[PDB]
Each structure stands twice: as structure tokens, then as C-alpha cells.
Amino acid sequence: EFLHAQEEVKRIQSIPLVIGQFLEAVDQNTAIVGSTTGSNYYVRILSTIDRELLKPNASVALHKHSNALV
Amino acid sequence: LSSVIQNLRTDQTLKMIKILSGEMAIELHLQFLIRNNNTDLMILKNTKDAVRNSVCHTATVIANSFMHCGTTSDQFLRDNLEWLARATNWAKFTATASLGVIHKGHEKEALQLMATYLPKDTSPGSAYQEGGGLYALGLIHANHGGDIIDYLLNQLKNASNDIVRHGGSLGLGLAAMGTARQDVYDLLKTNLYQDDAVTGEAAGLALGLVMLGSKNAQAIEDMVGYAQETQHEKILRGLAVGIALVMYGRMEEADALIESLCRDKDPILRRSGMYTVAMAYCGSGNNKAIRRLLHVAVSDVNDDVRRAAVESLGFILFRTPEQCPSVVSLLSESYNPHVRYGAAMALGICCAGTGNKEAINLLEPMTNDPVNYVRQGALIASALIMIQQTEITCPKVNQFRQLYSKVINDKHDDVMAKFGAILAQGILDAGGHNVTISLQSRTGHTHMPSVVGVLVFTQFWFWFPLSHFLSLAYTPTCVIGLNKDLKMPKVQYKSNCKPSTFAYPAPLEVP
Amino acid sequence: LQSVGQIVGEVLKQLTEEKFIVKATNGPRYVVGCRRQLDKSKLKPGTRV
Amino acid sequence: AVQKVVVHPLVLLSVVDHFNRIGKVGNQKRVVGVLLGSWQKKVLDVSNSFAVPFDEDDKDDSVWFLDHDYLENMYGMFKKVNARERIVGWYHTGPKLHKNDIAINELMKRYCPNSVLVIIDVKPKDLGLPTEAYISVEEVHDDGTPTSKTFEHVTSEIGAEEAEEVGVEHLLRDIKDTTVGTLSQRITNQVHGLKGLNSKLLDIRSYLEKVATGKLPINHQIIYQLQDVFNLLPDVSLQEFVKAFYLKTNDQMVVVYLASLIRSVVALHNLINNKIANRDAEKKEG
Amino acid sequence: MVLESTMVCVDNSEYMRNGDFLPTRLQAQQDAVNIVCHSKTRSNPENNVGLITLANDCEVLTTLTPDTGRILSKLHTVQPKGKITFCTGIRVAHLALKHRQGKNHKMRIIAFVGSPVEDNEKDLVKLAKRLKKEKVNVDIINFGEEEVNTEKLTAFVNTLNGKDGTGSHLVTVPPGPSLADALISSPILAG
Amino acid sequence: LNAKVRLLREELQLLQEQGSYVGEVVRAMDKKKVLVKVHPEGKFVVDVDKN
Amino acid sequence: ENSEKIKVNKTLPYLVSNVIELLDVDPNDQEEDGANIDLDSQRKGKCAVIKTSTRQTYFLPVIGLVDAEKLKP
Amino acid sequence: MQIFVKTLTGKTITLEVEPSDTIENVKAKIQDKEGIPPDQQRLIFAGKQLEDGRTLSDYNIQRESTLHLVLRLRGG
Amino acid sequence: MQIFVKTLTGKTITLEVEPSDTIENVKAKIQDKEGIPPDQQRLIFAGKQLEDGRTLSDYNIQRESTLHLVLRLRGG
Amino acid sequence: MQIFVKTLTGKTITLEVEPSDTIENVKAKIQDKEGIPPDQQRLIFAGKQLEDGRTLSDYNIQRESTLHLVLRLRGG
Amino acid sequence: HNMSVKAMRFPPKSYNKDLESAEERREREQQDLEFAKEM
Amino acid sequence: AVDTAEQVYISSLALLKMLKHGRAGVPMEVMGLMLGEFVDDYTVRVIDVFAMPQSGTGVSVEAVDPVFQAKMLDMLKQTGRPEMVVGWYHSHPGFGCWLSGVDINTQQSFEALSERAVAVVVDPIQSVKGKVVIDAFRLINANMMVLGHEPRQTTSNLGHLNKPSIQALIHGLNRHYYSITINYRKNELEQKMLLNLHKKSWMEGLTLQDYSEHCKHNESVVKEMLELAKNYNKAVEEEDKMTPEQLAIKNVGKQDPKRHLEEHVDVLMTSNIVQCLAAMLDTVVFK
């Protein structure tokens, strides 16, 4: 059952997304980012993202409206 | 009894039959419940005024009928009639049906009684009305059969239209239950075969009652064949219960039928397998039923199978109430709410009559579950258990009493949740606090009509006007001393302990 | 009257068979999917779209 | 010509719908239809289909009916709503070849010079695969028998599209699957292998009965092939091949030993974390 | 008025090249077809017609079509060849009549016979009887040489429409002027 | 394990909510008010939460 | 009615903007039905590219209520 | 080979048929003997719904079977 | 030997077979006795569904064993 | 005269008309009968579209002919 | 491995059992979303 | 009055065709027509669906040939599909699911022509392997509802199992219409197919992998183990030296060697086991 619901949350990785830059993570499941529109944000991240690949200044993609790491 | 009466008849004997067939006991119970009547109408007045016109309207005129069960106290519906007239369509049917529960067992001259609240009060049709009338005449005689049967049978034949047949087959399949009268089985099967989607549900259920527990080589084929090859759904949702009643305690005998139904592709037959393995093993506590009846809950792929599979456990264990919380208490934390609802009902139904503490301990935190219908389930279950208790007889009662009130008063809450609370108000005060639920006779024999009562009741999920089927389960709690002439002596008794433990809940009708 | 303009922009790279990165001329970058018939062989990095 | 053919699920569901519907027009035991598709680099792709009226008088060959100018009309009506696809071949749902279908093929070939036959048996009675592919050829003979016009086999498979497998998976709520990893290997590639191989050898077994005067030896060809089979099968596992086998088994298992050792050490480490954490916090909270 | 489906089963055997009728039997029949189908459609506009031909195999040329021209331009370039085969033709026309577009139509077969028929009589009697219970009506023109086939056909039609059915005919003709001119318009409206 | 599946199921709804800005405080005012300036805009004088 | 329906559209709060380019357009090589666009293929005249004051740049597939002859960059 | 038909009105109709007949034919016989249009008739035999294109012996209907007619009402 | 097979209605059949007998002969003789078409049926013993190619001895079936017949009642 | 017009739903309508009537009058009668607006509905006869500008005689609409009605299908 | 995972992995204790979430939170959120809806 | 419980049964084939057609008009609201029958007052069943010739402009579409529809439909009957029209469907990419503006108008005339019509809307671009987004609607009454009448009757829990989304509330679903629950009812034969749909031939199962190349893979992973063991020693040494969560929070860049060490097991295992087993079997079954 866990495998069945595991990928069910990639409705969020839909096609139209904004590109932003990664800054730093407060605590796991939350971080701060700077969008290409120029304004910074403090936002939630999604769980299934592997944490061993986000490093200082790596281009990530954010939800268009909610502004959440995806 | 129907057998032994023949060996007895072939004088005092001519009146002894009046005890053997129950004629006395019924009217003694009636006289007790009418005299000892005691209710505070203020609660109804409140919930009435809190009604903002909605589904919730119906829940009053069902619930009211619970608290006046057996007692002929019409005087709540006799007045405030204009608000009652606001009902319409199918709901009107249910309102008329409640006129049964208030008169339950008021056997004699019933015919003129309902003809004072006629099926043709204006000869209107409104055939929700008249079908109601038949459903009431079925409920008065709920297990007495007798001279009414040959009336209702005729009255089914000449039904104009397909709602009258619905009430008719329900009433007839109610009164004549257990008898296996072959003419009745013929008439019901021919109406089932007519294959109309509303009547075939009523008839498909009733068909199961008149064969109750008498396993029958032929009829099970004549109905599983039909169920296995028809396209309307309601017909299947009727038959899925209609099958199981052909087994009753038959222990190992039914197992062949079981292995058929549980293999089926069709989800509703796969379900009805579970009801069968519940009714086949009541009270036995046999591990061999549990080991599979629970395995279905953990893996099957369609939710109503999971709910019915979990909820059935409430019947296997009811002879040892201590056990159920030891197994369900974990399962109540499942992710998908259907299982949680089933757990609430299993728990409520295992230990229905007692004040058992751990059951309530687990039921309390469910009342805030986000998903409204499990709140409805927990409220009903909470109210079935804890029947008749006082704050001395168990603590943790008077907070529920007000919980129900506040949730019914809340202006911004789901109707489907606040249906449960308004049903619970009536459950907790049934009959005028003089009646109780039990699956268990005084001598220790399992009691049949209440078992059927609750199994049918739990289907109110699918079809509302079915809820009155709980009124089978209110056995009265009283004692009577009787003279040799069967006169009533004016004797007294005493009781050993501080009166506050027994008392009626001290009505607090401020105005 | 029943017609609408369309935004101009520039392509940076093709990511997968259906994911392209574009930069609008005005500002924010984006991730956007193609239309089926457009001969994806032709969207070299740098073409206006 | 063709090297392989690929079928999309939409065709299979279409076939089944047709098979169930016919009961409203006849009583026949077979149905026939047209395959729309496309292809490139000798890989053929079938995508869509429609069914045309057909009928046959069962008790004889050579008496059958097939409606041309309904086929042509539908092909016209389809072309108007998808230009990508063109007549490619035909399908029928019988469990076995029939005498006259070569004479069907010589008709419908007038619509496409390369036409291919797909048998889609709708009621499997075994573990297996639902499709077979055939193409028509001419055979010479060494016996001086005249030139024969006869079918030839082509390998086949199911394919997929991202816009459909979303639907397939939304619908595959029926039973268990995906017993992950080592669980799925042995089932999928030992048991369901051996069952197939056994069924094949039973089929050969049955055929070699009929040659007990029940039927004429169909050719020395088939016997030559059988003799190749029993000649080729691997040499008796009795020579220095054995030495070469032991070497690899040792090497195959040694690394397993290593990995198992790693596997245990981590459990001990996790054990210690659980132990200390417990007792400490206990005494602390006391 | 009554709606009818009609299949015309022309004959094209080798024997059709001989010259009893003036141009050659092929032109002796094409005009007859041309008039009979005009009569079928002009009788009522939604009747409809199809075409079959008898050789060493039977062959369908155009299924039930409401426009006559489709048949005419089709009937041309049919070539005299091979040997007739009667039963198989009638069977395949029975099949093709089942699949008519509108089942409220009742149905007919027309056939032109122009050669010896090598059939066993007792096969015709079976075919006729089952066609009898299937409500298909047959109607034979002994267009070509009357002899040889004179008997078998007559007994066939008897066994079919007999028992006082009366809906099915045999009609026959010597060599002479045009079939359509002298013959076909004479017996009844057609057939 | 059941708890973990519950959380994962709800994450899709939960992370649909919008985020929050980050700014630099320049100096605090009295009666619980503060003057903070955001990254691309004007200084905002604004209150504080209860905790 | 047609001229009034045009008139009632023209509410005067227009934006203002500058033409950047005029383009010659040719349909695609291939076509479809059930799903074809009036604007990708099936255009053959002139098209324009405009720069708005608020620094947008829009392509226009249909010029609108002015004859393309009289425009220039 | 006798067959009983029951309509919604309960009138009983008697049919002399053959095991290899077809539903189209019996529906037509009813049309002749009562006047109901064929295509409005739907046939019911226990649960199964009978299909026009095939024959009684395929459903192994036996002598004096009782068989129901249902009317698919139409919108208006 | 004598084996027992149970049907849902409480019918029981007793049947004569041999240890080396295969499932196909069993289904055949049940057809010959009762007339059930060989395919419409499944045989259940020990909570498992049997495979048509094996023998009874392959499933450790013993004397006077009873197994459950599963049936698609009307076939269709 | 009487004329039958039938729709993709399977419902059928009968109209009274005189040969001098135009198509527009037909559509107006349909709207009166059912409430569909006159601009939505398309008509078909003998496999070619109807258009206003003509009388019903002009297409040789005979007594008791059958017309097809099909709705405008727009979305956005 | 079996003995180790089998034995002293008992520290999952009832000293602290299982948790939950808030109860007014969802109410507030639903009220706010219904306010948004009305608009 | 309409019962709350009434279902829509869609028949698995129709769904696949709705998707493969919607995910092509990628940015445009393609549309089509849908065929079925009204079994009963508690049912509607859709059995098949087919496309049309149509053209649009991004902001809209509509179909251009009216004759094509009647001709196709009247053709289909000749092969056992006499069923007629019950509704229509159109695709919304990425928006969500609702009816808006024009879609109500073309809808409402159906209901004047045929009560009990149904409009379906599907979304092909949010959907993903686990689940497809479909909805089915019908219009609320043309008001006269100041009476406060409910649109429907209720006599079951059966209709209140689901939570309406915020988006449809924004566009007003319960204000102008109502949703109806979708249900699937597969028959025996198609579900027998649907499981075969992935089976792979016996030919493969008995086949061995090459022994060379296989050895190469073994040596690759074994030499990859080293670095992870070396790193693991330090990672063991240094823990509990700081506050607990500040382990993870400081380990977002560099990898943690436990997982990478562990998941190189389940590659030596599985692989070596299955290869040795398959060889060990087939050494007997052939001669």
C-alpha cells in the first residue's frame, strides 16, 4: 500500500513550473529559496526529494502558485 | 413450540395453550410498558427547533419513535402536525412507518387503528402513504404471524404500483418470518422475478425471512442464480442480506456455500459471504471463523467488503465481551476511514448492553475524527452501549449527554454527522428507560429476533426507511408476580441499596 | 475579434522528450511542454519561440 | 519483409468489445476486422481498428461472405479524422487456423500489397500471450509437388504509450502483484517457464500418436527437424565441463558471503543505538 | 407497394459465348438486367439490388446498393469463362440477404440459367426445403437452352413454392428476339 | 508504519498552501511593533505574533 | 447589428504600443482533423510582433482592425 | 412445444414454437397476435435478458416455460 | 476408490476413481454423471484450486476425501 | 401536410406544414415545440444540409418525409 | 542477523505511545476557506 | 425528484479512448460525443464514445460537419451497436474540472431535448499512473429556487462520501449544478485479458545471462564498496558529538554512507542467487 501511495503525490510535478535557486534549509521539511522574479521565500519541501543532491546554489523547480519545493 | 403444542393437544390445557403461544406474555408486557411510562418531552422540543430544513428533519420522526416504543403515546405527533406536513416524497413513507413502533404489540383491533390513519385517508394515491400503512401492519405483529398473514398475502396481489409492492413485501416478509409457508415463498419469488428495480429489493430481502435458519436445498439456488445474472444493483444490495438468513448457527454445514461466495468476482457477492460467516457462527467464538473473517479486512480491494468484514466480528465474540477491545483497539487506527467506521460498529455491537469501560475509553477520541461519517458511527456506537446507565453506575456519562446537545446545536456542521447525534438521543432513552438490548436470554440461550434486528439495522447505510428494524431488539426489563388464577396481586418488594443507583435520570426541564 | 496574442520567448535547452526550459524576454524562466507536431528536431538551444 | 509487429492495448479492448456485441446480429463463432497502423524500418505498429460484417456457413469451406463496400466506406470515414494511419492487415478471433483464410487474404490484399494476419484468441485456457502474427509466402518443394501458397510466422509483442498506461494502471485494481525483487524473479522466470516447456513437449507427444496410422507422415521435413532437436541438446554433463562449473559456483557464492557479513554488522550497530537511547532516556524521565 | 431486396445472379459460363440470341448471349442478358433493375427501383425508390456471378467459384460484385448505376458500370467487363455451379451461388446469396440494412424488407433472388447443371436432384430438394422454411423466394429464368435443365428446375420450383405458396415462378424461352423485348415484360410485372 | 503512510497521504493537500517572505529588521518600535524591510520593496512597520 | 457589435467592443481605454516586426507566414507541411488549429497552419497573410509600453512583447497571429499595408516598423 | 408469455397486465399468451426458432420470430408472432410493435418488446427469462440474434435452444428453454415481457418506455 | 464432491445446495456425489487418475477424467465423469460442461467448474480441496494437469496423488488426496465443487450456476 | 423529424436521441416529432413554408419557419416551430433556439439546430435531409433561403417545396419535401435534427456542439 | 533484530529491539515502549494533530486547526481552516468561497 | 444515489457506469474502453484523445489536443479543449443507455432511475451506462471533425482557436472549438454524425451513427447499427446518444465530453488541460459559461449553454439544450442528460469532463495532464481525474455533472434547475428547495432527494449516505474541491467551489458547482459519482463495472472477459496484458514468454525465463560481463559487474560493485566502508568508519566515530537533529541538518550535502552501503547489498544478492539457481535448474531439465 505504501508503494501505491508513494508516487501518488507527483500530481504536483505537473508541467508548468517556475525555476528558482536554492539557498539553505532551516530544518528538514522546510527551507528558504530565491526565485528568479527576485523575491526570496521561506517554504515547505516535498518529502520524496532525495536530500543528498541539493547543494548550495543548485537550480530547483517550484510550484507556480504555492511556491513549494518540488 | 409449534411442534410440542400438537403432542399436548393430542380444561386447564385450553388455557395453558394461551401461555404456550405467548398470548398472555404479550399483553402483560404491553400493560407494564403503558403504565410505567415516563418521558421528558423537552429534548424533542429543542432538537425540533434546531432543525434547519434538511435531511435532519427525518431523523426526528425516526428518533421520536424510538423513545415512545411500545407505549401508544401518540401525543407528540398528534399536535405540531403542520411542521410534520413539511415532509415529502420518500420521507413521507418513513413517517407513516413509525406509527408501527409506537403501537408495537398493541395487537388487537389494529386494523381499525390504522384505518383511522388510513392508507386512503383521502383515497389520494400518494402511494408512499399506503405502502407505509402495510409496513406498519407488518411491524405491529413483528413475530406473531397468525391471522394477519392471510390478509397481507391477498393485499400484495392487487397492488397497483411498484411502491405498494415494496411496503407489502416488507410487511409480509416481516410478520410471517420463520414459518417457511410455501405459498408465501411462491408469491414472493414470482414478484421478485418481475425484475423491477425497486420492488425486487424489498422482495429479495423478505424472501430471506420466511426461510430463516431452515437451510433449504432449493431456495438458495433459486436466488443465487437470479443474483448472479441480473443487471440492477439494488436487487443485489437486497439479496446480499437475503442469502445469509438461510443459514443460522448451522456451524460446519454452511461451509460449502461459504467457499462459493468468497471466491466470486462480483464485489457484492464477495461481501455477502461475510454476512453469512457471521450468521453461521453467532456466539461460537470459533477461531476458524476469525482467522479468515479478519484476513479479508487487511487485503481485499473494495471498501464495503472491508467494512462488512471488520464489522462482522461483533457477532462472533458477543458471548465473551472482554475480548473485542483486545483486537479492534489497534485496527481503529487504520488510514482508510471505512475500516475505522467498521471498528466503531464492531465495538459497539459486541457489548451492546453493558456499561463496559474500555469500549467507551476507545470510542471517546473518535468523536473528533475529521471524516464526518466516522463521527456519525462513533456517536451511534457510543449511544448503544451505555444504555440505561446512571452516573453512579458508570462515570463518564453526563458529558456525552451534553456533547450530543452541542453538536446538534452547532450551526456550521455537516448534516451527515449531526444525523448520528439525533439518532443517539433516542437510542439512549428508548422505550421510556424501561428496555434494553441483549443478544442473550436470561437462561443463556442466544436470542434470535434481536440478532436479526441489528443485522438489518446496520444497513441503514444504504436505505433509510430500514432503521425501524431496530425495534425488534428492545426487550423489557421488569418482574411480575402472578396469582394462581393469573390475577395480579398488589404485593410489594424491596431493594437493598442506596436509591440513587437506580433512578430515572432526573429530568431537568427548566421551563 | 475572437483571437489572442501569444507570449514571445527564447529556448535554453530541451530537458526530456516533453520538457523544455525557456526564458521569457521579460523575466522569469519557465519549464514548459511542447506541442506534438512541431518537429522537435528544430528547437535547437537559442531559437526564438 | 516485416521483422516484428507491435500492438497497443486499445486494439485488444476493441476486439473483446466486438466479440461480446455480435450476439445481436448472428450466432457465429468467429469475427473479422481491419487493422489501421503505420510502420518504419521494418517495425510495424498497429494502433486502431474497426470491424466489418462477415459470415460463413460452418459446414463447408468456400462458402463465405465479406462486405467490400462497407470496408471502403469506413476507411474513407476514418481517414477524415486521422490522416496518420492506413490499412495494414486484418484480425480474427478464432482459436485456430481455418481452411479458407488464405482465400480471405487474397481478397483483402488488394487494399494493401503487404498484409499481415493477427490471431487474437479471446478465451485463453493457459498461461500465455494473446496474439500471433502471420505473413503469406510461396513455397517450392523438393518432392516436385507444385508450388504451395502458405503462411509463415512473425514474432510479436505488446507495446505501450504514456497516454494509455496511465489508464491501464488506473484500471488494474484487481489482484496482487509486484512481490518485489527476489520474490518475482523465480516465479516469473522459473515456474512460468517450466510450465510452458512442458506444454510444448506434450503437444509434440500428442502429434506423434496420429502417425500410428491415424494420419499420413506430413513430411520427412518434420522428422528431420525432430532429429536435429534430439541431436543438438547439450552433451552429457559428464566431462571436464564439471570442473569449469565448480569454478564459477565458488566465485558466485564467495561475494554472497561477503555481502551477508556486511548485512549483519549494521544490525548490531542499530541494536546499540536502540539500547542506549532507551535506558538513558528512561532513567532521565524517571 | 412492398419493399424488397433482390440479388441478380448473372451467368457467365463458357456457354455464354455461343450465338442463339442475336448479338451473343452476353448482350442478350445485359439489356434484360438493365430493364429489370430499372423496374425494381422505379416501382418503389428504396428497394435495393446486388450482384453475384457463377463460375468455378462464386463471386460477389456489389452488395445491396440503392443506386442502379453502380451495378451497370460493374456488370460490364464480366467475361465468359469456366463452368457454372448453381447450389453454391444460391447459398452465398442467402447469406448476403441476411445482412440487409433494414430487416423490415422481405427478400427475393433472381437468377439467369444458361448452361447444363450437373447437380444431383436430391440436393436441390434439400436446398429448396430449407430455403422454404427461411422465407426466401426464388424465381428462375431458363434464359438459355431449355433442354437438360427443363425438368430439375421445374421440380425444384414446385417443391419450393408448392403446398400452394404460388409466390415463385419458372419462366422459359426459345431462341428468338430480345429477352427484354419479347419475354420479360410479358409474364407479370417482372420475373 | 501506519502513521508514516497517513502523513504521506496528507502531504499533497498540506503543501498546497502558500509560503512566507523573509526580511531584515532594522529596529524595533514600542508596544510590540517592528520596522522591517523586505528584499525588493519598501519598509513595512508591522506587529508580531503572540509567542 | 454587426456594426453595432463591433462598436460596442471598442471601449476607448486602449493601451499604446509599438510595432517591432512584420512577418510573412506559410502553413505547415502536414495537417489533421478532429484536432486542427485555425492559427498554426491555415494562415497565409501577414503577421506582426508588437512591443507594449509595459515592456511585454507579444506575437500577433491576426492583425486586427487595420490593413497591414499601412504599417511599417 | 408450448410457451407461456406474461405481460405487465398479466395476460397469458400461448405459443407453439420449435427449439431452433429465433427471438426475432417469437417477437414477430407476438406482434401479429396482439399488435405490439416488435422493437418495443424486451424479453426476460429469470435474470437473463434475451438477445434477438440467436436461438431458443441456445438458452435451452424447455416446454411450458413462463417468460416475461418488459417494455422499454421511451422519452417524450 | 470412493471420493466425495459437494455442491452448494447440499447435494453430495460419490465417485469411483483410481490413484493415477488425472483431473481431466474426473471432470469428464462428472460430466457423464451430471451433465456439467467440463469447463464451467473448479474443484477446491485443502483450500487450494487444483491444476488440470496433475494427478490426485500429486495433491495427497486420501480415501473418502470430500472436495468442494465451485460452479457458475447457469453458465450464462 | 404532416412531416416527421427525428433526433439523435431517438425522440421523434411530427410537424404540420404547407409547401410554401421556409426552413426558418420549420426551426421556429421546433423552438415553439421544445425550446431549442433557432440558431443552434441544424437540419438534414436526403444526406445534404438544409439552409434558409428556400421553401420546403423547393427541396421536394414530400408527404410524410423524414428529417434529421442535430444540435450545435460548441465548447470553450 | 535474526537473533539481533529479534532480541533487544523491544525499546519501542509504552512510556510514550502515539501522538496526533490539532483539533481547532481544521475548523479554522474550513471557516477561512468558506469565507473565500462566499467571495 | 432525482435520487442522490444514482450512478454513472463507464465501461473501461470509453475511458481509454477519452484519454488517448484528450492528450493530443494538448492546449485545446477537444470535445466528443458519447453513447449508452438509461437502464434505470438509479443508473446511466455509457458503452462507447467517438470523435468528430472539429476546429478551434485555442480559446474555443466547435465541430463543422453535421452530416458526418448522423451517417456514422446510422452506420454502426449494422454491426450490433443500436445504442443511442446520452451525452458528451470535453477535456480541460490543467485547469481542473468544472463547467463554465458557454459549456452550460450547449449543455442546457440537451436537457430540453432529453432529460437525464450527462456532461463529462476529464483532465489528461494532471492525471498520473495511479489515478485519473474525471467528473460528471448535470445542471441545477433554472432557479425558481428562492423556495430553498433542495435539488435532489436523499435516502442514503451513499452520495456524501466525497469532499468537493476548492476550485469547483470557486467556479460554483453547488451553485449552478451538481456532481454525480463515477463507478466502474468490468465484466469477466475483459478483466481476464487485462491481467495477461503484461505476461512475457516462457522463452525468456530459462535463459542465462552471459557469465562474462556478469563477472565484470561483480567486480565493479565490490570495488565500489571500499570508499563506503572507509567513510562509514568516520561516520560511526563522529556521531552524538553534537545535538541530534543537527546530524541530519548538516548532512544535506554530503551523502550518508549507511544507505549507499546497504543498497549495494540487494545487488550482489538477488543477482548472484538467481543466476546460480537458474543454471542449477536447467543443468537437469535438458539431457
Side-chain angles (χ1 to χ4, degrees), chain B residues 298-311:
Chain B
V298 184
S299 67
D300 216 275
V301 301
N302 182 50
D303 283 60
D304 284 313
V305 169
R306 306 179 94 145
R307 292 196 299 99
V310 160
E311 180 276 348

Side-chain angles (χ1 to χ4, degrees), chain L residues 132-192:
Chain L
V132 311
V133 178
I134 298 184
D135 209 353
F137 300 90
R138 190 187 299 129
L139 268 51
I140 206 169
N141 292 307
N143 303 319
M144 296 78 64
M145 208 54 53
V146 62
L147 284 298
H149 295 167
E150 184 78 329
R152 306 153 90 184
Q153 176 164 226
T154 180
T155 61
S156 187
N157 280 246
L158 195 60
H160 297 59
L161 270 276
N162 297 107
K163 185 68 61 177
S165 74
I166 186 167
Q167 187 69 356
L169 284 161
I170 290 163
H171 301 293
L173 97 175
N174 290 303
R175 225 288 194 192
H176 288 150
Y177 39 103
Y178 46 83
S179 174
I180 303 176
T181 165
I182 273 75
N183 176 21
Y184 309 88
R185 194 177 70 178
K186 302 152 62 183
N187 78 42
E188 166 71 3
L189 193 61
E190 63 202 337
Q191 87 174 52
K192 262 172 169 161

Side-chain angles (χ1 to χ4, degrees), chain L residues 16-31:
Chain L
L16 269 67
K17 296 207 299 181
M18 286 175 180
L19 293 191
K20 80 101 185 178
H21 179 46
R23 186 41 192 279
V26 177
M28 185 170 68
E29 298 187 61
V30 292
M31 70 195 320

Side-chain angles (χ1 to χ4, degrees), chain I residues 14-41:
Chain I
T14 66
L15 194 67
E16 189 81 46
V17 295
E18 304 88 59
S20 63
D21 202 4
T22 65
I23 306 301
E24 69 175 18
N25 296 317
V26 174
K27 288 184 169 184
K29 63 180 57 166
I30 294 166
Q31 149 57 26
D32 296 336
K33 202 292 200 182
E34 199 62 30
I36 179 68
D39 192 39
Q40 307 179 1
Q41 51 169 357

Side-chain angles (χ1 to χ4, degrees), chain B residues 184-478:
Chain B
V184 177
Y185 171 74
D186 286 336
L187 178 52
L188 262 44
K189 193 173 68 167
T190 192
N191 271 56
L192 166 63
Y193 267 53
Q194 177 60 14
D195 188 67
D196 183 330
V198 85
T199 65
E201 175 177 26
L205 167 62
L207 201 68
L209 278 301
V210 303
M211 311 303 288
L212 175 53
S214 57
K215 68 183 299 197
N216 184 313
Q218 169 248 49
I220 76 174
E221 291 190 332
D222 279 5
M223 53 212 291
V224 313
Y226 192 101
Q228 199 171 130
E229 292 299 346
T230 179
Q231 293 176 44
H232 310 251
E233 284 297 320
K234 295 193 67 169
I235 310 294
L236 305 190
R237 296 201 301 242
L239 261 53
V241 170
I243 306 304
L245 273 53
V246 184
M247 301 302 179
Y248 192 98
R250 282 281 183 166
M251 298 295 296
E252 307 295 340
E253 300 180 33
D255 78 354
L257 178 60
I258 292 299
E259 286 195 33
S260 171
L261 300 193
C262 299
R263 298 281 176 176
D264 197 329
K265 88 178 198 288
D266 187 354
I268 181 154
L269 276 292
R270 220 186 308 140
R271 166 154 65 103
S272 179
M274 302 310 149
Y275 293 156
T276 303
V277 70
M279 298 304 285
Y281 281 79
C282 297
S284 68
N286 182 19
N287 300 311
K288 194 60 59 169
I290 267 65
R291 187 174 285 104
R292 67 193 298 284
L293 178 51
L294 145 141
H295 167 75
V296 170
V298 184
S299 67
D300 216 275
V301 301
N302 182 50
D303 283 60
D304 284 313
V305 169
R306 306 179 94 145
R307 292 196 299 99
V310 160
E311 180 276 348
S312 293
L313 257 43
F315 291 117
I316 288 78
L317 298 179
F318 83 96
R319 189 146 285 165
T320 168
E322 310 90 343
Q323 292 304 99
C324 272
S326 77
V327 297
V328 184
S329 61
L330 179 62
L331 189 64
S332 59
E333 306 322 299
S334 61
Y335 50 87
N336 73 313
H338 281 288
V339 168
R340 304 207 290 262
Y341 186 114
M345 278 308 307
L347 202 56
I349 205 171
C350 175
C351 60
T354 85
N356 183 63
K357 207 64 53 59
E358 298 68 24
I360 308 153
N361 163 79
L362 284 165
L363 284 177
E364 176 167 32
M366 295 295 177
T367 203
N368 301 112
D369 194 314
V371 185
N372 46 19
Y373 52 93
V374 50
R375 292 197 293 272
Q376 176 195 97
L379 294 171
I380 294 285
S382 159
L384 290 187
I385 195 173
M386 313 169 64
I387 182 69
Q388 312 224 127
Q389 306 297 340
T390 77
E391 192 66 31
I392 291 163
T393 323
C394 58
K396 196 182 279 199
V397 175
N398 293 354
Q399 76 303 328
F400 283 166
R401 296 291 216 82
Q402 61 177 10
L403 190 166
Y404 302 172
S405 79
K406 89 176 190 71
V407 68
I408 187 151
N409 279 119
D410 188 348
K411 203 176 308 298
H412 305 294
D413 210 3
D414 284 338
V415 291
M416 299 310 292
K418 93 179 64 174
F419 183 81
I422 170 161
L423 266 290
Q425 313 287 50
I427 296 287
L428 194 50
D429 292 59
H433 328 86
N434 303 332
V435 297
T436 187
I437 312 299
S438 175
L439 281 63
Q440 183 68 78
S441 64
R442 273 153 196 144
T443 66
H445 291 80
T446 164
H447 184 52
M448 172 261 276
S450 67
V451 172
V452 167
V454 300
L455 176 62
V456 173
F457 169 88
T458 70
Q459 309 312 75
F460 89 119
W461 208 97
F462 301 115
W463 186 240
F464 274 28
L466 211 55
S467 303
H468 296 40
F469 259 64
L470 186 54
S471 72
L472 297 183
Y474 296 141
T475 70
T477 51
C478 67

Side-chain angles (χ1 to χ4, degrees), chain E residues 1 3 5 33 39 55 62 64 77 100 106 109 115 119 121 149 154 159 164-165 185:
Chain E
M1 202 293 294
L3 298 184
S5 296
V33 185
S39 187
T62 182
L64 276 64
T77 189
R100 56 185 184 282
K106 62 192 191 183
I109 307 182
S115 288
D119 200 2
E121 176 64 34
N149 307 330
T154 318
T159 55
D164 317 327
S185 202

Side-chain angles (χ1 to χ4, degrees), chain E residues 22-40:
Chain E
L22 296 175
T24 189
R25 279 169 175 166
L26 294 173
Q27 184 64 61
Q29 63 180 19
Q30 294 181 25
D31 49 2
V33 185
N34 274 261
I35 177 59
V36 56
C37 59
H38 296 163
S39 187
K40 291 302 175 188

